[PDB]
Design a protein around this nucleic acid. Structure first.
Ligand SMILES: [Zn+2]
Ligand SMILES: [Zn+2]
Ligand SMILES: [Zn+2]
Ligand SMILES: [Zn+2]
Lengths: 197, 197, 197, 198
DNA sequence: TCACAAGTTAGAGACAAGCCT
DNA sequence: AGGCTTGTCTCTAACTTGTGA
């Protein structure tokens, strides 16, 4: 219920977000719009999100992803999966059915059903970039189209990536808008070229 | 799931179906296509169906309405409501959430499934035309759009109306196709003008 | 399945990959394209890969070969043999049926299943160049066409050659694209001459 | 290997004949029949209408079996089944076992069979008289693998044997036709015809 | 009554690509 | 090996179809 802050806060470690340049090819599964700060992606397909830091955080550091409705009218409402996809039986064996945001590839992922705020969140332990890399990449999945009747229902959302210590304190925070659709390449091009109005 | 017969059969009482002429307007809620034998109607809106008989059946006679998928590859599936709509709580106080076809106004209505075929059906006791009238009218509601994700899923259906004695024996039968869409007038006009081949 | 990095990393030893000049003469079994960094080869045929290093590594050092899908959409998916080639009598007695990449000769070869990751890989104990030669050559086999239905399914892959300490630490890695087809000479000549567009 | 059922056309005591729909070699058709080749070109999992013609209505309890056998002699004794790939992806009919190549749409009294001795796959429906004004009974068949499926039919042509049987399985009538399951029926039929003459 | 939003589908040739004249 | 075989791409588009000036 209570709205988590979305204010971009790099913190003491210079926590920034990175994405791949994929282009609006109309055959792409996931693309990012720097102008809109928005990720257009297909249902249940891979969403590569990069983590850039000026300095390596202490071990036991985890990262948290949470979805919140963008419009102020809907902010108090928890982001859940539509009743259909919830009973679709597509679980990876790790993620709860109702959760929208999943993490594939990571073995020690945890899924949170917040006792008080009722909000859904997913966490993985932070890992420094492999030797010679510049950043850590996390693959996210979104388990419902933005237009799904019974959940997001054509309401745009934001994904909040939060860097936490082992205790759960805030270290860094960044965010980006997400549209889950059938044609990311088409809808990104359309939406970008509509911003002129 | 064994497929109920759909062959029309007027029987010993000359059981016929009647409909209202509403015309493919722009703001119409329900419209019947004689050429297609198909009823285009909005979600949860009133669908008037008339019952015509040559001779008044014995008392205790019941009228059943059942929905089946028209296409052969889907016939063996039970027609229900989408996971979303069966949880929206729009219940009229009488109908169970998962039933697609409702009857409004009729207090002596019963909502049934079948012991073996598992199919949903709604019944009302047949009442003769009040003196002056030549038929009796039943108001049906369809509680899911034909395109409902998780429900009918863009699959067209047939509504089978059967005249039964108290025991459940067949007395008469008729049927028609149903599209539950947002714009009945538009979609009926489209399908009819597409039949020109 | 943790996504293994394709970060080309020569490390402290200057680990580089070399190949034989075989030419795109139709009727070659295995050829390498320097421009594409891509190896075109026939099914189950010998693929010579030689290892170039500035300084001889300590004994107990091993060389690991692993397959991975090039595209981001499929990167999360493990690389296996098609369901058909899995169950046909191919096994040399050493290699598991599921594994795509195997090593000819080299009796000290080991194939792992990676309980946690589930990713297939094959290892060889590193042996210094024989006297006169300036590199160590390894003969690899690819046990499925790139176009194998149910397997790679026309999706291009990369082979990740990693240099490892016995404990499994990273010393250096390189990678190259692999197309397993019927006509390597034809397909290489075609793909190279298409890059001019 | 597995023994070979006879393919010889035999109309029997009831004049059992096969009928097909005239569809033409369109460039977007899903199923077409070539009278010159006695061959049906069709897409995977798409409906294949097959008609059953009889002179005299046979006794009640008589059945209709459909079975696929390889046409070429060196492959006839091999059993025809779905490729290892298509076998493992749910295509479920709601009825049909995953491994069966030939399916039947609509008919709920369908049975998917496996011979005790020949180990061959076969699909059986109870014979039902023409609902007149039809002069024949039509059956919707599916083929759940392309003829070129690696690990399956593997580009080997096949024959579909339709047999009219009594309750016990005795032969009453038998006809057959060649089947190519491809992506482009209209193209492949037009090609092979324009190759047969002359 | 239109225009838009946002998921599903289609054309036949131009190719991909494995196999056999 | 050249020719052919045979399934896929290209993929806008046009078509669904519910929602909105
Ligand atoms: Zn959904
Ligand atoms: Zn619904
Ligand atoms: Zn294979
Ligand atoms: Zn197959």
């Amino acid at each position: 219920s209570s709205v988590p802050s979305q204010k971009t806060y790099q913190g003491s470690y210079g926590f920034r977000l990175g994405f791949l340049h994929s282009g609006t090819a109309k055959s792409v599964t996931c693309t990012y719009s720097p102008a809109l700060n928005k990720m257009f992606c297909q249902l249940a397909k891979t969403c590569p999100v990069q983590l850039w830091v000026d300095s390596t955080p202490p071990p036991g550091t985890r990262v948290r992803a949470m979805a919140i409705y963008k419009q102020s009218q809907h902010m108090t409402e928890v982001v859940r999966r539509c009743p259909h996809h919830e009973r679709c039986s597509d679980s990876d064996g790790l993620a709860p059915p109702q959760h929208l945001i999943r993490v594939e590839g990571n073995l020690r992922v945890e899924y949170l059903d917040d006792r008080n705020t009722f909000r859904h969140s997913v966490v993985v332990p932070y890992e420094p970039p492999e030797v010679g890399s510049d950043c850590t990449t996390i693959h996210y999945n979104y388990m419902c189209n933005s237009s799904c009747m019974g959940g997001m229902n054509r309401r745009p959302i934001l994904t909040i990536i939060t860097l936490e210590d082992s205790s759960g304190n805030l270290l860094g925070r960044n965010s980006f808008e997400v549209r889950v659709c059938a044609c990311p390449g088409r809808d990104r091009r359309t939406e970008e070229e509509n911003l002129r109005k």
